[PDB]
Amino acid sequence: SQHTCSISKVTSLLEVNCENKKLTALPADLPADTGILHLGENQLGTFSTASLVHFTHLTYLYLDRCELTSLQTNGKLIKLENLDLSHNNLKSLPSLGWALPALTTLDVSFNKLGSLSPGVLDGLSQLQELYLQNNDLKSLPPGLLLPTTKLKKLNLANNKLRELPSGLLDGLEDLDTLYLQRNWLRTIPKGFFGTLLLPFVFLHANSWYCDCEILYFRHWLQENANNVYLWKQGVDVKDTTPNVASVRCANLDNAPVYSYPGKGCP
Template identity: 30%
Template sequence: MRYVPQAFRNLSSLTRLSLEGNHIEAIGRDSLKDLETLYDLNLRKNRIWIIQNGAFTKLLRLGMLNLGHNFITDLPNQLFEGLIQLKTMHLEANRITAVECTFRHLLNLRNLYLNNNQISSISDSAFSYLHKLHFLHLSKNNLSSLPIRLFTELTKLKYVFLSHNPWRCDCKMLWFWQWTATRRAVIKGLDCAFLGPPNTTALNEPHPGDLRDCTVPLQLASEDKCSVGSTSVAPEPPNLPSKVILLALVCYMWYNVRGWDTSVATF
């Protein structure tokens, strides 16, 4: 099975659908449009690498989406538009390399699995507005640091898994020490010297010598990349010297006049 069967389009009262372990490669814009009552969708262990924008727009009641163990590489910003009731998202074991603003409008999201990917960068606004996020799994990626504002709005975050990443315990991650010191959360997998033993903080202990001279402020103003519109503005042409403009104009007029003369002579 390479595509979602059209037969499912007539099951308008379906609440749970599992297509795990097939060979599905693509999810089209209209593949799931009639499954408006669907609550649980399992597409785990397929070969999905194409998902058209709008594929989930009609799934307004979906609470669990499992896309784990597929071939997904990109997460366009509008990919999950419409999933306003989604609580659990599985994207583990794919080929994702970056996270930008894909999850921004999943206001009811509680559990997010992004482990076992190839993520090397995360936008500082990637989890903005996810006020209900409770569980975040980022283990087994290519992360060396996290942006300073990443967890700012995650007031209910209780479990964070970060193991098996090539972390750099330098000034860029000093903010993480401050954040963990004020939160009662289970944080595993980021074993830096300026952090205490697992699940504890080192508030009363001095920072290591290599971090004493950090000049990076703990609270750093940062542009909200997700608030920038998707439309781009073409850059203005560079300012040219007036002599260059005049020369180009003369050449243009000479070429047109010469071409007109030639055409008349030929005629």
């Protein structure tokens, strides 16, 4: 029948699926009570949140695979909890927190982000999950995660990170999963993990340099052998065994960092 999108409602939210419909623009005739909007596999190019301010039930918004080159956060989406911008061409992000106060899940994976601005996450006090994997990030700003105290999952894998801010994780007591595999990391700064307990941490495929400055990390690794994992496609970390040996000294023929003797270190 005639509406381009498929409209249904299995949960408490009216669900509108406009995926893969050769769209160039947002539909003009979306239902007023749209709660979940699927817009993936279209050719939107750009997206401004001002276009959805009048859908007062909108809670899930999927803009994945939309050819996006930019995002404007000029309209406030009061109820939005889940925003998916993955598999697009974003090179920068605007400030998100004024527009997206209720957000709990942000996915900006598979984009081309080269950096993040200082207060991009300011005001996202409810954020629980942040997916940034498969971008071009070279460093992260100081205080990035200070607005997001309830963060539970952080995925920074498959970027170009050269170093990490010393205080990146400070105070993130609910953080349970951390993915840093596939970066250009050579060391971990003293105090990086604090007294945080992180049951699922992935640190492999970096180029750790084993010398006297890797000793904070070696100790942490020994103490958290039970919490370091090898990422395995399509398999939930809960069905995998820990593998502390996955973390290796690139300058010592990939011998594991956990067993690095530190010979002749003060």
